[PDB]
Design an enzyme around this catalytic site. Sequence first.
Site, mmCIF file in Angstrom:
data_model
loop_
_atom_site.group_PDB
_atom_site.id
_atom_site.type_symbol
_atom_site.label_atom_id
_atom_site.label_comp_id
_atom_site.label_asym_id
_atom_site.label_seq_id
_atom_site.Cartn_x
_atom_site.Cartn_y
_atom_site.Cartn_z
ATOM 1 N N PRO A 134 80.094 0.899 57.923
ATOM 2 C CA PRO A 134 80.979 1.912 57.377
ATOM 3 C C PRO A 134 81.336 3.010 58.373
ATOM 4 O O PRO A 134 80.666 3.223 59.385
ATOM 5 C CB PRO A 134 80.242 2.408 56.144
ATOM 6 N N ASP A 135 82.432 3.688 58.049
ATOM 7 C CA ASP A 135 82.881 4.858 58.774
ATOM 8 C C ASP A 135 81.933 5.998 58.405
ATOM 9 O O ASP A 135 81.885 6.431 57.252
ATOM 10 C CB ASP A 135 84.348 5.116 58.464
ATOM 11 N N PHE A 136 81.180 6.470 59.410
ATOM 12 C CA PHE A 136 80.247 7.568 59.214
ATOM 13 C C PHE A 136 80.980 8.913 59.276
ATOM 14 O O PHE A 136 80.318 9.944 59.280
ATOM 15 C CB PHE A 136 79.121 7.517 60.249
ATOM 16 N N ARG A 137 82.331 8.907 59.293
ATOM 17 C CA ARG A 137 83.148 10.116 59.183
ATOM 18 C C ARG A 137 84.002 10.129 57.901
ATOM 19 O O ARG A 137 84.719 11.100 57.642
ATOM 20 C CB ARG A 137 84.037 10.229 60.433
ATOM 21 N N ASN B 3 82.419 4.770 68.272
ATOM 22 C CA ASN B 3 81.424 4.069 67.470
ATOM 23 C C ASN B 3 80.085 3.987 68.192
ATOM 24 O O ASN B 3 80.040 3.935 69.415
ATOM 25 C CB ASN B 3 81.804 2.628 67.159
ATOM 26 N N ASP C 73 77.654 1.621 67.070
ATOM 27 C CA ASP C 73 77.070 0.418 66.496
ATOM 28 C C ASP C 73 76.733 -0.670 67.527
ATOM 29 O O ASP C 73 76.194 -1.701 67.121
ATOM 30 C CB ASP C 73 77.992 -0.114 65.412
ATOM 31 N N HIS D 238 80.384 9.198 71.599
ATOM 32 C CA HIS D 238 79.365 9.770 70.734
ATOM 33 C C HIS D 238 78.005 9.087 70.893
ATOM 34 O O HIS D 238 77.172 9.175 69.990
ATOM 35 C CB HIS D 238 79.787 9.663 69.267
#
Lengths: 6, 293
Positions: free
Chosen positions: B38-41, B109, B111, B128
């Site tokens: 998922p998008d953590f934003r 990302n 991941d 990030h």
Amino acid sequence: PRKQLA
Amino acid sequence: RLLDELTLEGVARYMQSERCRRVICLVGAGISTSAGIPDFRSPSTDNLEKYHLPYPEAIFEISYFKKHPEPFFALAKELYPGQFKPTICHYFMRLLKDKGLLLRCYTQNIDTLERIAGLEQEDLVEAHGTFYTSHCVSASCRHEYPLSWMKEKIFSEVTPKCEDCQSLVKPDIVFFGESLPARFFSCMQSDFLKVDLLLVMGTSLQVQPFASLISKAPLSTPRLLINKEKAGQSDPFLGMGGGMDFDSKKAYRDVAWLGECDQGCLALAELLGWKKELEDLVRREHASIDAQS
Ligand SMILES: *C(=O)CCCCCCCCCCCCC
Ligand SMILES: [Zn+2]
């Protein structure tokens, strides 16, 4: 610089 | 203008021309959603009552974390993907690398799917950070641990401590309150002097300073966005610095393809003559991962 949310 | 037309065919033509040699990819959460990450934003997640936090976003702040790391690692457990299988979009970037076209991938990302898909450290600016490596929080030791090692400690709810000095081991992501990687600004200074094409995939370009990267492209440099939504345009709710212009009468270089990233890269690949190579690559890589659990 630093990682900020706001 | 370097694009003969403002379409995917036009971009594909430009890519196969002698003019296009150095491609920068800018990527975000939308390139990993089909891998079940998922998008953590975005509005995933909220119910952190459990962790007794001073304020919600303390879970991803560095001072908090070094003082109380258990919350973050417990949430890491909840969020940890059952498997790390890169998508068509990640393997597309591996194709670019194989064909000698990839100057750099800048990713938002964490991941690790870019690395799993065969992009090397040199090819990547993890704006990030990443979970791919972790380091001991002691500056004197700074012992490196692979993701497998971090996985185990997380999925066994035992806090990661260094084997050499027993310090906390933090994944190499950029928590809030940490400095953005110096490599980001270093590479940006150098890379944008050489870029012939900006592929922008799976990002709405909302987080800074990553968003600002599109303004770093030379004016002539064609820019293709593959995304579920158009993004990158000037925003009058801020000021009013060269945003994406797809649809105006002054548009000359920017193209938007709208849909799942996976379907976008398949379409670009089909136009380039790479769809078979891409399909064969994904299938053997997926099978290989499936086979290794
Ligand atoms: C800064 O923008 C980074 C935001 C960090 C999000 C929280 C980390 C999620 C942990 C789960 C790891 C699963 C993927 C490897
Ligand atoms: Zn150590």
